[PDB]
């Protein structure tokens, strides 16, 4: 089997992308954030504290196929310190025509304020490895893990757009979706992430520096976070750029034309256009813009987020030995 779904930026800045998911019988459609940085399927629901609800909710009691998962609970927090918790049902879940029965659907009893504040995201769909799932006492498999037995091929691809819709595909590779050939690189699952090592970087039309950059492919993260020296090397090529404490990152005049950024994938090269790195003005009408490449120093991990991934066609190969594939598009 296969599935194909359209993914849309939640705002004009491509802060995040939401993909429609059908849950339950008859189907309830929710807009979930597909997150390759986590492994929990959780949604806003009829069980969520009402003052914490502003989103479309899941109502388990309206689904004929929902089943309470007795004694199971979950609790999760993310990179930005936001969090949610609750109990667990299994239900039928469909994405772009691909249907999984008995999928664990984590029902939120409580959510942090940033989740309440964002009206466009109804929940998250985790696509990292299942060892990161927070359900206890027994961890639950991700949507991808459950689908693998039925997929034509054990893969999914991300094709995220710049200020435009994109596609998530399951179980097949759309050869009309990219140019050139796909380059595959090995994945480490030791920490449960789609973790890989880039072979180096170039700024604009300068030289490619071979240097290992271990990082994770995280569709749930907006920007590109790289080691400080790499990031310094980039912004040095932007004459009015500087680091801003008040803002917490590099900023530059919105009028500047930004250099491209290239990262290595084995012997291949992926070029992020300068325009993708112009993330947006710090406030509407402002003459200063926020940069899309920032230091990973206070995070502890390098993160290849949407800024980076939307410049490529990305293949998440979930075979027993998983790999990452990148193509130019």
């Amino acid at each position: 089997s296969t599935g194909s779904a359209t993914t849309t930026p939640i705002d004009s800045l491509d802060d995040a992308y939401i993909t429609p998911v059908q849950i339950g019988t008859p189907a309830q459609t929710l807009n979930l954030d597909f997150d390759t940085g986590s492994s929990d399927l959780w949604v806003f629901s009829s069980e969520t504290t009402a003052s914490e609800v502003x989103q479309t909710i899941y109502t388990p009691s309206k689904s004929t196929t929902a089943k309470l998962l007795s004694g199971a609970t979950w609790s999760i927090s993310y990179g930005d310190g936001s969090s949610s918790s609750g109990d667990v049902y299994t239900d039928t879940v469909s994405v772009g025509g691909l249907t999984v029965t008995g999928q664990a659907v984590e029902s939120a009893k409580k959510v942090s304020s940033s989740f309440t504040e964002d009206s466009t995201i109804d929940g998250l769909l985790g696509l990292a490895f299942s060892t990161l799932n927070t359900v206890s006492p027994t961890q639950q498999k991700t949507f991808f893990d459950n689908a693998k037995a039925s997929l034509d091929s054990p893969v999914f691809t991300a094709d995220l757009g710049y200020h435009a819709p994109g596609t998530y595909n399951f179980g097949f590779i759309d050869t009309t979706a990219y140019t050139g050939s796909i380059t595959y690189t090995a994945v480490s699952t030791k920490q449960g992430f789609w973790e890989w090592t880039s072979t180096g970087y170039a700024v604009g039309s300068g030289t490619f520096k071979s240097t290992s950059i271990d990082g994770i492919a995280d569709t749930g993260t907006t920007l590109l976070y790289l080691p400080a020296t790499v990031v310094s090397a980039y912004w040095a090529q932007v004459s009015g750029a500087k680091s801003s404490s008040s803002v917490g990152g590099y900023v530059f005049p919105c009028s500047a034309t930004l250099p491209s950024f290239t990262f290595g994938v084995g012997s291949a090269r992926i070029v992020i256009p300068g325009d993708y790195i112009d993330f947006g003005p710090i406030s509407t009408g402002s003459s200063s813009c926020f940069g899309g490449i920032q230091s990973s120093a206070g995070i502890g991990i390098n993160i290849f987020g949407d800024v980076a991934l939307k410049a490529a066609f990305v293949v998440f190969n979930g075979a027993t030995t998983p790999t990452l594939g990148f193509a130019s598009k």
Partner: peptide, 8 residues
């Protein structure tokens, strides 16, 4: 709407 960092 914020900037998003999806889990440690």
């Amino acid at each position: 709407h914020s900037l998003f960092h999806x889990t440690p």
